Amino acid sequence: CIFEVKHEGKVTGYACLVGDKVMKPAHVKGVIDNADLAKLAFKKSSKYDLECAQIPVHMRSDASKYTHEKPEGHYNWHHGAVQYSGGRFTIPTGAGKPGDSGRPIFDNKGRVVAIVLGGANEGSRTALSVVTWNKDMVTRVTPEGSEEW
Ligand SMILES: [Hg+2]
């Protein structure tokens, strides 16, 4: 489900197969390091800093489901455990760096809950700037002073 965006042979961010679309942050330079995915036609959306396309039938079995359901508590992500509360995802400052955009924040059942775009450093912890699903529609939460990863 996770695929890496490469630029001049260097990993810039990530791309993710969520729902029936193929996502990757718009700000990420490079092209998805996967033939099938790279040749697709993406629809940019500067409001959401998102850039989606549709998953080829032969990879649709490889998508990851999403969900609007996110109760205060701890979520899972590649570098550890994210914490959700007050309508804000955070992590121990230092555990997320530039080049982590595109990485999904899963819950304990595997449902992708948000997609990291960058983070604002507010001391001990960094409030993440993510793309998250609302009632049905996509949304983007960007804490004051975010540094786009
Ligand atoms: Hg994914």
From Swiss-Prot:
Where does the UniProt annotation locate this protein? Virion; Host cytoplasm; Host cell membrane; Host nucleus
- Sites annotated Involved in dimerization of the capsid protein: Y75, N108
Domain Peptidase S3 as annotated: residue spans: 1-149
Q: Where is this region: Interaction with spike glycoprotein E2?
A: 43-48
| Active site, UniProt feature | H27 (charge relay system), D49 (charge relay system), S101 (charge relay system)
> Which superkingdom heads the taxonomic lineage of this protein's source?
Viruses
Tell me where the sequence motif Nuclear export signal sits in this chain: 32-42
Region (Dimerization of the capsid protein) location? 71-81, 107-111
Question: What is the stated purpose of this protein?
Answer: Forms an icosahedral capsid with a T=4 symmetry composed of 240 copies of the capsid protein surrounded by a lipid membrane through which penetrate 80 spikes composed of trimers of E1-E2 heterodimers. The capsid protein binds to the viral RNA genome at a site adjacent to a ribosome binding site for viral genome translation following genome release. Possesses a protease activity that results in its autocatalytic cleavage from the nascent structural protein.
Q: What is known of its domains?
A: The N-terminus contains a nuclear localization signal and a CRM1-mediated nuclear export signal. The C-terminus functions as a protease during translation to cleave itself from the translating structural polyprotein.
- Name of the featured protein: Capsid protein
Q: Which organism is it from?
A: Semliki forest virus
- Relative to the complete UniProt sequence, the shown stretch is 119 to 267 of 1253
